[PDB]
């Protein structure tokens with residue numbers, strides 16, 4: 001049974017958080033500790049529910065040899081009760097998660113910016129919805145650095 005859990009969150013769960021989830025899953029799978037972890041991603045919004053990751057994100061993960069398979073889903077009340085960590089991308093995500101967390105029965109989760117783990121101090125993982133392939137590459141690299149640091153030692 002899993003003993004550790006992380007939910008990556010962004011606005012739509014189509015660009016940033018599916019990438020963070022996929023990067024993190026590859027780390028724990030390659031280290032044969034995936035059975036210890038629950039890894040997932042979700043949206044603050046219901047707008048994209050059911051949709052796969054953005055093809056720019058799919059292309060970026062294919063180039064880097066990272067498996068990614070996801071259907072967008074909106075965060076639920078249950079998620080605040082069950083996850084150890086909710087790691088989000090930007091200041092608006094953090095405000096939205098903190099507001100929802102204050103209105104549910106149980107908040108087990110520590111809610112933090114994923115970028116707070118970056119040794120290169122690029123705090124915000126910026127929404128690449130209107131962005132180019134370079135902007136997706138920047139997001140991927142932020143996720144690589146932050147996910148490695150989080151797996152090494154959680155705040």
Ligand SMILES: Cc1ccccc1-c1nc2c(N)ncn(Cc3c(Cl)cccc3Cl)c-2n1
Pocket residue numbers: 011012013014015045047048127128129
């Ligand atoms: C369109 C937009 C303007 C300012 C800041 C963010 C976005 C913005 N980023 C988005 C992203 N990464 N993925 C999907 N969408 C579609 C969407 C819309 Cl149009 C409206 C409410 C929620 C969502 Cl999810 C995004 N919209």
